[PDB]
Write a protein that holds these residues in place. Sequence first.
Motif, short mmCIF file in Angstrom:
data_model
loop_
_atom_site.label_atom_id
_atom_site.label_comp_id
_atom_site.label_asym_id
_atom_site.label_seq_id
_atom_site.Cartn_x
_atom_site.Cartn_y
_atom_site.Cartn_z
N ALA A 1 32.11 144.50 67.41
CA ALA A 1 31.15 143.83 68.11
C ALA A 1 30.36 142.67 66.93
O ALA A 1 30.13 142.78 65.82
CB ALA A 1 29.84 144.78 68.42
N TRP A 2 30.24 141.36 67.61
CA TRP A 2 29.82 140.20 66.78
C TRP A 2 28.50 139.62 67.36
O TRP A 2 28.39 139.54 68.57
CB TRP A 2 30.66 139.17 66.61
N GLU B 1 42.47 150.03 51.62
CA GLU B 1 41.27 149.03 51.97
C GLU B 1 40.65 148.59 50.59
O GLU B 1 39.46 147.99 50.47
CB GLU B 1 40.08 149.67 52.84
N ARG B 2 41.62 148.41 49.51
CA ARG B 2 41.06 147.86 48.20
C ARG B 2 40.88 146.48 48.54
O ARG B 2 41.41 145.68 49.20
CB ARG B 2 42.16 148.02 47.33
N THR B 3 39.61 145.93 47.94
CA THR B 3 39.00 144.71 48.32
C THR B 3 39.86 143.50 47.38
O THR B 3 40.49 143.91 46.35
CB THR B 3 37.73 144.62 47.89
N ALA C 1 41.22 136.80 56.10
CA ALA C 1 41.92 138.15 56.03
C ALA C 1 43.03 138.49 57.09
O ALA C 1 42.92 137.24 58.25
CB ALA C 1 40.78 139.39 56.44
N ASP C 2 43.98 139.20 57.13
CA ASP C 2 44.82 139.59 58.18
C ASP C 2 44.49 139.80 59.48
O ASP C 2 43.57 140.66 59.64
CB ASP C 2 45.82 140.32 57.80
N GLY C 3 44.92 139.31 60.71
CA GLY C 3 44.51 139.29 62.04
C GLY C 3 43.19 139.04 62.38
O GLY C 3 42.56 139.77 63.22
N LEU D 1 37.48 145.16 62.21
CA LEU D 1 38.03 145.84 60.93
C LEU D 1 37.60 145.26 59.86
O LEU D 1 38.17 145.15 58.79
CB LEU D 1 39.65 145.58 61.25
N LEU D 2 36.18 144.94 59.77
CA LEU D 2 35.76 144.96 58.25
C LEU D 2 34.38 145.74 58.23
O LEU D 2 33.94 146.43 59.21
CB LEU D 2 34.96 143.38 58.15
#
Lengths: 220, 220, 220, 220, 220, 220
Positions: free
Chosen positions: A1-2, A90-92, A101-103, A114-115
Amino acid sequence: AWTPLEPKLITRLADTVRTKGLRSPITMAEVEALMSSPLLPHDVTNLMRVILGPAPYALWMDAWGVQLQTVIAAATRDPRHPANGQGRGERTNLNRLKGLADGMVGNPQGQAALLRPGELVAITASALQAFREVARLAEPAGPWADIMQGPSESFVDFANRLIKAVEGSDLPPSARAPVIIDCFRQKSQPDIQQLIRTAPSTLTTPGEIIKYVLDRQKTA
Amino acid sequence: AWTPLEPKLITRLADTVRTKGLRSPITMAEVEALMSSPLLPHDVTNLMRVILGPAPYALWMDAWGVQLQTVIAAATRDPRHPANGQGRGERTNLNRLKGLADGMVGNPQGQAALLRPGELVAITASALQAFREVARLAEPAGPWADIMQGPSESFVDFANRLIKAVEGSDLPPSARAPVIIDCFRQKSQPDIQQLIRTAPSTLTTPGEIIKYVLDRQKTA
Amino acid sequence: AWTPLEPKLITRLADTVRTKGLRSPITMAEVEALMSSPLLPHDVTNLMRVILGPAPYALWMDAWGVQLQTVIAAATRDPRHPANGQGRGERTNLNRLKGLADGMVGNPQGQAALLRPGELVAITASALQAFREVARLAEPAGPWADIMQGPSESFVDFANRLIKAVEGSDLPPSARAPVIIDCFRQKSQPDIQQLIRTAPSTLTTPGEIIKYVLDRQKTA
Amino acid sequence: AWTPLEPKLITRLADTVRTKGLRSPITMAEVEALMSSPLLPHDVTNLMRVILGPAPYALWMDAWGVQLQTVIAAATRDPRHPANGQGRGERTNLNRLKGLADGMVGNPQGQAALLRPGELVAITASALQAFREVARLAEPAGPWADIMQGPSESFVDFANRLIKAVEGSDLPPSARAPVIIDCFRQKSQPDIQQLIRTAPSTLTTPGEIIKYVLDRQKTA
Amino acid sequence: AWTPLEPKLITRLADTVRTKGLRSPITMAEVEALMSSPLLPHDVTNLMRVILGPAPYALWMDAWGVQLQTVIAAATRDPRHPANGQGRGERTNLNRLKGLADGMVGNPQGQAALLRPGELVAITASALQAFREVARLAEPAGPWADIMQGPSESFVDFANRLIKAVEGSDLPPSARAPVIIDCFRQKSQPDIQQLIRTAPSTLTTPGEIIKYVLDRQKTA
Amino acid sequence: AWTPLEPKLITRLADTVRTKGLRSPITMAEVEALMSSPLLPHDVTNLMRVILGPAPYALWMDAWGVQLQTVIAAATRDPRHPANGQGRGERTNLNRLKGLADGMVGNPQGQAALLRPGELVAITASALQAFREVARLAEPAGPWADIMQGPSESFVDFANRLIKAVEGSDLPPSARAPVIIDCFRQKSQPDIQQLIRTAPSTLTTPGEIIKYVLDRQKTA
């Protein structure tokens, strides 16, 4: 959700900036109000592009890289950091936060899916830091040490001016209290010096000395 | 279930506090209607940073620290205080409130993930009274025991000035009414003296004194 | 579930009471619209504290006392009173109105879960009428019977001055219309008197006389 | 249940009136927008007092009496009128509508409880009629018959001006179509006359002739 | 369960129609999003009176009458039309729609108390298309078959002008595209001629022609 | 339950697209925020009709065609497509997107009760990217490689001009940064070139070079 923004805030922001410039208090005030909640790379990029011209925007991005890599190093310093979540896959990383980021490229929906929020909080804070850095670089004015309480300025606003000036200069954290206090003692209006030297020498932070001088300050 | 503040509210609050003033009521009314729900340290910190400059912010950190000290003393000296939960082994300290131990440091998500409503409302109350004290310290209240009703003025605006001033004292909470009334009787013009004295002395509250002296005053 | 007052409402109300002045019907209609729904003692009292000066605030407190006093005395005198409490221990009392009794201070939730809706409507009624009384006694209405048509002011502006004067005094309902009529036929300049006393019909209402002079009005 | 107003509408109305005057189109436009829904005597009185000075307010009230009594006579003409409800103990009367009804004086809640809406609709319509009457009387300008399509005015706005002028003069209903059309034929710009005389002589209303001349009107 | 329109909406609509214009889209978009719910005659009549002057209002009555005539013919000639209810004995006439028979005359309450959704939506649709026709008749559309792309202009604003104009014709709904395209090819400057001709003739829609000629046009 | 778009949103959007111009990020962020939630073909198409000129509207229609074409081709090529329809007769198709098939025209309720949310998200995605494409191809970005630092324009304004130029062209991501760097080291005036080629370190990012010149900037 954004959860995006609304044109009211952004438009009033653009108008205030166009009529004042980044050296304004109200400018940075509205910016801090808009950027308190958890944000996303897409929205923060677009917002800074709204308030900053092109080349200062690039400079913004450079500063953002510096601050982001500082936070990456901090994340390296400890796994239990909120940037290093309880999933090891999930290492930053410098690319992860910045937003490429990917996708998720140009598609903030995935950035909402996915964040992890604590990362976004660190992003926001580093963003505001970089923004004050850009306000400094693009629009400098007076150095810190050379400030004096005017022949008529009230003391507390002089204090605001001085603290905001000092903390926004090359000095490090530890040198932000005693330096300010000594500037008080050896530059402010004479009567206020005589006020301060009387203070018990066991007082530390600047705010305590400000409280001290506020009581004993006259009403004219 | 955490939720920050919709930046519209912080924005409007910042506008009014930069414009109107810190001692006039609407400031306090808005602040209270804002600072009533269960909050968290990070919730109020950045809020104070936004609606205040630097130096009053330092004063605010000072007063918030003192009030948190009071809350911690009261909680630990009485395990019957809401600041603790079901267990005594989970006492509440200053670090748990000032955001200093783990699960909390710079982690608004963790600060939602930890403390119980008691400490929350305690911190909110501390912040609120701290703001009141920062208001009283941060700006002057006139010399209440000095104002003398001027000729070209009406008694009513004088009375409003006097109540405003007298309220801005160290004076105890209750014993204002006698001070106000006697300042009325002994601090006014000749005519107002001779129109308050000659009344049937059943007027022993300020509002009634205003009612009288105005109801029998020039209309032009 | 006690819903407070939206701060924006109160703040705009304060701006209005500030600039637009108390005795302008904008304020009257607005304040009625803000105190129209059921309302509660603590909220409305703090409201009046917000929107007024402190001395007229105490004036309002006294007026509210008198009004709610008539209300509670009527509740005593009548069992089928508009706002009675039929319960065998559920009658009304004055200190169960001003927010004084157990569980009323600081916790408006008690002011909701202890009080009956009829009580709240009585409270709001007394509050509104009290505010209107403060409006009357707070602004000195010009002396009406001192107007005499000027040698070069328009007739209609004279009429507006005099009617706004008349309706704002001690004069009961009946004491409006005829007083206006006769002040018109006499207080006016001779020329306009010369006209209105050249009676071709009965002129028995202020508006009718204004219509006559308007129809016969040479612009000056 | 009483549904009051909001200060936005009323304030924008007051500002528009103060800056333009009742001879404005936007003034009467906002007034008609505000007064479309069913209203109450209290609200309509207060609103007209907001937009009208004192003496024109009295004149407003006189006109309102005239229109209200016309509607009372209409109500007498038939029981099945919406003003004569299906309860005979509710026969309409000049005092009933005007608002000084029993158990409702200065207390619009009762006016919301025990009034019937169709009466309120008739009230509103008569109110707007009286208001246009006050706009006429207080602020006259040009008589109707003496209007000409200017040496440069576009036709349709001239038509608006003329219809609005005529209908707002002493002429009765029946004399509102052919009078306007003949004014068109024998006063408008010559080319438009030659346009009109060509029209089939079986056309009645003015709007049909306006549609007629609009097609054949050039684009310049 | 009837309900009128919150005057905020009619107010904003009146503002935009007095300001912008009747043929530009936002007018129509607002009107549609307003005129979509089941309405009643009195609902749309006063709305038209508010958002239009007098003479276009007469045109509007004309076109609404014609469209209601069409609806009545369609309904009566086909009892399978929604404009009737469960019974054939309750046919729908013009008086039932124009508000002429009892239970309806000047009675918005009765108009809520009578008709069924079919006639309601029918009347709304009639009003809407009537407004479109009043727009087209009430204001000119330029001579579409005449505009010739000027030198100092860009082809794109020319194209927008031309589509706007061509849309404002009696032309059938579908057969616009060929007219537009051929006017493009045969109505432009020399260079645009020679840059549309020499293309690979798979461009047979207007937007594509614009895409081409712009993508290969000067950037300065 | 299909909720349309609030007309106020669309109208303010039109005001923005009007004055603030298409290629300003205010518009981009706003339009994203208006087409962020799930959206439907008919609504968004009419939206783009409202907020744009008709010729760029057709341009947008074509771009939307191409984008949704890639989308439906991807849905064909992939069973586990992001927006597929797993039902045994519930696959996607292009005419089930542009609002063409049975029960799609005029009745968006069918566009809701026939279409799946994945389909709506694909539609909205294609619409947004299409609008951005219309933005690019609708405003001619200035030619970038023609800039040469002026004899008396500030360095930073030159930088803004050139960067806004570069990022707006055909150049892919990689073709931004280095092109900027080299245009800076070469296109610039000799004096600023004299500086930036007096290399004391690696200047390998536009922002860094701007920071260097800024630190070394004599105000001119």
